[PDB]
């Protein structure tokens, strides 16, 4: 007659409150620690790889970023650390870091021609180019905006309105130009005192240029500032200007909304499928914990900073 344990000769270590290391027979791990180390698909929809461009450069159409003129549906956006192309002309985009919040909830865009380039019979849309945005060794400019310069030594006032008639929203961009001195201002445009006014059902704005002396960035001594707004299905947008105006030509239409994100990584692309994603790899496990990176997308196991989590289900 004997009563006792069901012994064994395995090897595995667990932790308890008053014994630091203890041997067990059966044990089960919960913390995954491996990744495939490449960018994959997510439920069968390819992501968007901006490669060597920025979000602003894509939305404004850099001459060196012409591969993304038409873009299909995506799931998440990948952006490299420290882009190289960006905005060729020095300046800034007003209310930045808030447009990125408007993104990550849009999964598909559509492009619409709102004001044709041939609709300006009393201006000049040809010679407005600069050497800071070259295309194959020649001066160029953005492709979604028009820079207007006097024609026949004149610059009449502008009154332009656009009436929305679709069933979805829009996104419009426009800008201003800051000069260096009075002679340049009277050589590009003609009037010495200029302004811009924009109004809609919920926005009211007036602007004036600044003329001063600054340093050199990318070989230029001028500046440009850009703005954005979202238009409702039945509203309208109005424009009035006298100079220093960068007119809009294309607009983006929101057609699908959902869940997305913006990443920052430098991992290369690979042709494979997965259902969870991290900025340094992918996960194909069923355990409920991981310690790879706290930013994820999809359904993912929970995150902890530890590196050992095994619960004992054995004896001894």
């Amino acid at each position: 007659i004997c009563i006792g344990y069901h012994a064994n000769n395995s090897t595995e270590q667990v932790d308890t409150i008053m014994e630091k290391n203890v041997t067990v027979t059966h044990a089960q791990d919960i913390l995954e620690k491996t990744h495939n180390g490449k960018l994959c698909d997510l439920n069968g929809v390819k992501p968007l790889i901006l490669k060597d461009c920025s979000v602003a450069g894509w939305l404004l159409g850099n001459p060196m970023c012409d591969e993304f003129i038409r873009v299909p549906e995506w799931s998440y956006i990948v952006e490299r650390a420290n882009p190289a192309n960006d905005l060729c002309f020095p300046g800034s985009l007003n209310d930045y870091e808030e447009l990125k919040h408007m993104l990550s909830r849009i999964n598909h865009f559509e492009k619409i021609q709102i004001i044709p380039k041939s609709s300006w019979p009393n201006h000049e849309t040809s010679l407005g180019v600069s050497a800071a945005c070259p295309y194959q060794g020649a001066p160029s400019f953005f492709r979604n905006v028009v820079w207007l310069i006097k024609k026949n030594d004149a610059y009449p006032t502008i009154k332009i309105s656009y009436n929305n008639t679709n069933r979805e929203d829009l996104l419009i961009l426009w800008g201003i130009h800051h000069s260096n001195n009075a002679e340049e201002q009277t050589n590009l445009y003609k009037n010495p005192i200029t302004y811009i006014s924009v109004g809609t059902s919920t926005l009211n704005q007036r602007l004036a240029p600044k003329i001063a002396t600054r340093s050199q960035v990318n070989g230029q001594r001028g500046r440009m500032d850009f703005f954005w707004t979202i238009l409702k299905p039945d509203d309208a947008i109005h424009f009035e200007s006298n100079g220093n105006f960068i007119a809009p030509e294309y607009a983006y239409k929101i057609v699908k909304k959902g869940d997305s994100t913006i990443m920052k990584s430098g991992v290369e692309y690979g042709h494979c499928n997965t259902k969870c994603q991290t900025p340094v790899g992918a996960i194909n496990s069923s355990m409920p914990f991981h310690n790879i990176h706290p930013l994820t997308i999809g359904e993912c196991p929970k995150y902890v900073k530890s590196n050992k989590l095994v619960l004992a289900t054995g004896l001894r």
Epitope: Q113, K117, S118, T125, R143, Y162, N163, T165, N166
Partner: antibody, heavy 126, light 112 residues
Framework: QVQLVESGGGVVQPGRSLRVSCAAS????????MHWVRQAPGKGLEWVAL????????YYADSVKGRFTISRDNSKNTLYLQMNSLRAEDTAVYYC???????????????????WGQGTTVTVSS | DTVMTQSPLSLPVTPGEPASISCRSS???????????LEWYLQKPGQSPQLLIY???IRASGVPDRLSGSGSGTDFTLKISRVEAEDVGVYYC?????????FGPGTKVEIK
């Protein structure tokens, strides 16, 4: 000045192929779209092909679909058209014309044709 | 596809008096932004064509002050204020809203 000249016509029997060329000089050739237009004898005008400024997208009509090809070549300022499976009703005169404004990045961008060439003749016989 | 009709096929009107031609389409050539995509061309006897009007109203560089176009939706019209002896030729109508571009039958103008 701005001018366009074309050459490469002749007489070709049914079957086989042919090639025509337009050459330009006077403006930046790598910033504009180009078109082809054909006019049969005793009839009106019609439309054939369209290409972009760089050369990615292309469009053809339903009477020359899948049977014609259009391509550019920079650094020499030339445009080409290759005609396969020649029938008998393609006897006409061919023109090459450009857009009126630069950098069209859509299929129908609203710009028109401003500058036209002189023309070449292509015939099918025997 | 979109058929384009153009009547009449002959106009023996000269000189001094005005003139008018019409062009009709089987669909609405109106964009969502309020502009019409309709053009007019001209071919003098024995040479290449020459553009007249880009959109429904905007003239070109070289066209005299006499010519002017107006219309919307499906009916379009070209009007010549006064006619000279150098305005003999054929006129054409062209649409640019769809991917395949289509011309029309045309119209001759002859001195009578």
């Amino acid at each position: 000045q701005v001018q366009l000249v074309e050459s490469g016509g002749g007489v070709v029997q049914p079957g086989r192929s042919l090639r025509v060329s337009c050459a330009a000089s006077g403006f930046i050739f790598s910033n504009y779209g180009m078109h082809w237009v054909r006019q049969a004898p005793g009839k009106g005008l019609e439309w054939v092909a369209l290409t972009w400024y760089d050369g990615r997208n292309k469009y053809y009509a339903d009477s020359v679909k899948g049977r014609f090809t259009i391509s550019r070549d920079n650094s020499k300022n030339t445009l080409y058209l290759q005609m396969n499976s020649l029938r008998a009703e393609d006897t006409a005169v061919y023109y090459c014309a450009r857009d009126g404004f630069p950098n069209c990045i859509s299929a129908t961008c609203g710009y028109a044709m401003d500058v036209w060439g002189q023309g070449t003749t292509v015939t099918v016989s025997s | 596809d979109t058929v384009m009709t153009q009547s009449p096929l002959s106009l023996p009107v000269t000189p001094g008096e005005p003139a008018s031609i019409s062009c009709r389409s089987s669909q609405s050539l109106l964009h969502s932004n309020g502009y019409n995509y309709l053009e007019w061309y001209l071919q003098k006897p024995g040479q290449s064509p020459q553009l007249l009007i880009y959109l429904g109203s905007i003239r070109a560089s070289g066209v005299p002050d006499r010519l002017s176009g107006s219309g919307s939706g499906t009916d379009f019209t070209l009007k010549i204020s006064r006619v000279e002896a150098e305005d003999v030729g054929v006129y054409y109508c062209m649409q640019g809203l769809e991917t395949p571009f289509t011309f029309g039958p045309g119209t001759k103008v002859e001195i009578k």
